[model samples]
Target: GRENLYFQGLKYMVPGARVTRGLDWKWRDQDGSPQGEGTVTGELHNGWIDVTWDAGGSNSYRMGAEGKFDLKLAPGYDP
Candidate 1:
């Protein structure tokens, strides 16, 4: 069995919009190739949120959202 960990410390939100942060962990068999079991967690900053399904797995996915908008990642881009 192998273990991988990750974390996001700082998060920003656009004004006048509702937002939610989420994390997901997934498991796969067949030498880490085929997807198997999975879990997910999410929460809203100002509203109700739930994380009942985010406790076990192999691969993890994290993201933030606001209504129909999604936060993008670009450390440094000039174009």
Candidate 2:
């Protein structure tokens, strides 16, 4: 009746380093419960070790900076 964990790391550190352990776990049921929640995450770069999940409530989002935009007006776009 108690299971909720969320985490993040690697704010910065890479020189003879040891701080690439970025792990995350999120089981959502913030209040409207019905035994529906789950998560298990882990990450470590260079030295290897990466595990991830957000099942039972799929569609786990992950879209890092995808883009395409172009606008041009020679000296008058609106100055």
Candidate 3:
């Protein structure tokens, strides 16, 4: 496991659009080969948003107060 792991991505949305149409994200490893990549889809819930990932499996996330998210990895996640 790694400490302080972070990922970044760029989102493109229509002007004045409140929700993102698509998202791309990636995180690099120390040696740089074992990287993680995924595409995210967002949906608006009751006053909140739910983000789902299409990586090796489906992962869900909810935003935190600090603008971060908690990742909920699905069963049988390799890493």
Top candidate on TM-score is 3
Which parts of model 2 are misplaced by more than 4 Å?
1-7, 10-36, 42-55, 61-79
Give the alpha-carbon lDDT of every model: 0.26, 0.22, 0.29
Per-residue alpha-carbon lDDT of model 3 for 1-79, expressed as tens digits?
Answer: 5333232212221112222122222222211123333333554232123432223443333333235433323234333
Distance (Å) between predicted and true CA of 62, model 2? 6.6
| Count of clashing residue pairs in every prediction | 3, 0, 0
**Distance from true location, Cα of 43 in model 1, Å:** 2.3
Best by lDDT: 3
lDDT of 1 by residue, 1-79 (tens): 4321211212322222222222332212311223222222343343222222122332222333222222222223112
Candidate 2 lDDT tens digits, 1-79: 4322111213211122221112221324421234322221333343222222222332221211121111111122122
How many clashes (backbone atoms < 3 Å, residues ≥3 apart in a chain or on different chains) does model 1 have? 3
Report the Cα RMSD per candidate: 13.5, 18.9, 13.0
User: lDDT rank, highest first?
Assistant: 3, 1, 2
Q: Report lDDT (Cα) of residue 69, candidate 2.
A: 10
Give me candidate 2's TM-score against the actual structure: 0.16
Of models 1 and 2, which has the larger lDDT?
Answer: 1
